[PDB]
Structures are given as C-alpha cells and as structure tokens.
Amino acid sequence: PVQLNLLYVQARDDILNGSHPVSFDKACEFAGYQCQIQFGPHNEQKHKPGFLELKDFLPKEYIKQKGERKIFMAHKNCGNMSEIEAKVRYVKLARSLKTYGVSFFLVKEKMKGKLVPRLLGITKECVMRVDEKTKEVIQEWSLTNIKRWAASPKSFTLDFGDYQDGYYSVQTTEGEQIAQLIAGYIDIIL
Amino acid sequence: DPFTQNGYENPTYKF
Numbered sequence: 136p137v138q139l140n141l142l143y144v145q146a147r148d149d150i151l152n153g154s155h156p157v158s159f160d161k162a163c164e165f166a167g168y169q170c171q172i173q174f175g176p177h178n179e180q181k182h183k184p185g186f187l188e189l190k191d192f193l194p195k196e197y198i199k200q201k202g203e204r205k206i207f208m209a210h211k212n213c214g215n216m217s218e219i220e221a222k223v224r225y226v227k228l229a230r231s232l233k234t235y236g237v238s239f240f241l242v243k244e245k246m247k248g249k250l251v252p253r254l255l256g257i258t259k260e261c262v263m264r265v266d267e268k269t270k271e272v273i274q275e276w277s278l279t280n281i282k283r284w285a286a287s288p289k290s291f292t293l294d295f296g297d298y299q300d301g302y303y304s305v306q307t308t309e310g311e312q313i314a315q316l317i318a319g320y321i322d323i324i325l
Numbered sequence: 326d327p328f329t330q331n332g333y334e335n336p337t338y339k340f
Contacts, residue, residue, distance in 0.1 A: 136339075136340045137338065137339035137340065138334075138335065138336055138337065138338035138339055138340065139336050139337070139340065142336060223336070226336070323329065
C-alpha cells in the first residue's frame with residue numbers, strides 16, 4: 136500500500152494546511168475519515184470530548200468553529216471501515232473536488248462597494264475564482280480565454296479579450312508568481 | 326515525456 140499511503144498523506148497534508156481549500160462541511164468529512172485512520176473505529180468509552188487536538192485534523196480557519204461534534208459524527212459514520220478503506224475514501228473525496236490539483240493564491244478583489252479576499256486558482260486547463268470562505272467555485276475561465284496577463288509587485292491582472300468586459304485586477308504581492316505559473320502552462324501546449 | 330497529458334497513475338503501485 137506504499138502508493139496509496141503516499142497519496143493519502145499528500146492529500147491529507149494539502150487539506151490540513153489550506154493548499155487544497157475545502158468548505159467547512161468537507162473539512163469535517165475529511166477529518167471523520169482521518170479519525171478512523173488514526174484511532175480505528177469510534178468508541179465512546181475512549182474518544183471523549185476535548186480529546187481531539189483540532190490543530191491536527193482541520194485547517195486553521197476552522198478550528199474556531201467548534202466542530203468536534205461534527206467530526207465525531209463523521210467518525211462514528213465510518214462504522215468498522217478498515218484503515219485502507221478509509222484511505223481510499225479520503226483520496227477519492229479530495230479528488231472529487233473541483234479544487235483538487237489546483238494551485239491557489241489568496242488575493243483581494245474590488246467590488247461595487249473595501250477590498251474582499253478571494254482564492255484565485257490556476258491549472259493547465261483554466262483559471263478560477265473561488266470563495267475564500269465557502270470554497271464554492273464562482274467563476275471559471277478556460278486558459279484559451281486569456282488574451283494577456285500582467286504582474287506588478289503589488290497587483291496581478293488578466294485581460295480576457297472578447298470573453299469578459301473590463302479587465303480583472305487583483306491586489307497581491309505574488310503577482311509575478313501567479314503569472315510565472317500561467318506562462319509555464321502556456322509553454323507546454325506549443 | 327510520454328506522461329504529460331493522459332498520464333493515469335496507479336493507486337495500487339507497491340501496495
């Protein structure tokens with residue numbers, strides 16, 4: 136099971152550190168599985184409230200949310216699932232998510248009313264805006280939709296040509312990093 | 326080289 140363990144660990148780490156943004160509801164599904172993997176089947180006589188160090192089973196934005204009740208429910212819900220079954224399920228859940236395999240940056244946008252954070256994610260196929268809190272995918276642009284791109288030290292910008300009206304502009308210090316990624320994905324196609 | 330597009334990977338490798 137070497138490669139399955141390598142997969143699970145990658146996917147678990149990326150979720151646990153925010154590399155792979157997941158909704159709170161999904162954070163607890165993942166944790167539920169992690170509980171099964173690390174403690175076996177749930178046993179009320181042994182898994183008492185307060186015993187779960189949330190820093191080790193949840194992304195940090197969600198520790199404040201007092202979701203131990205939610206985690207123990209998902210942990211109970213696993214029944215007598217084997218460790219390896221839980222790992223296959225953990226990986227399948229991660230991969231079932233639009234956000235899987237997506238490099239993200241946390242950036243601030245402007246709206247029609249104060250600058251709001253937003254997760255900007257890049258892959259080889261597209262570029263997406265994703266809700267920084269709910270993680271719902273709110274806009275998806277194919278890479279062939281990008282006329283041109285530009286990076287400041289304190290900004291990143293996309294020009295979509297005839298596909299959207301008005302440039303997409305964004306406060307970020309990683310602007311040169313976002314664009315480096317995009318250029319590399321362009322280079323492979325040609 | 327041949328694994329740049331339809332590169333499917335095997336979760337049972339060295340299981």
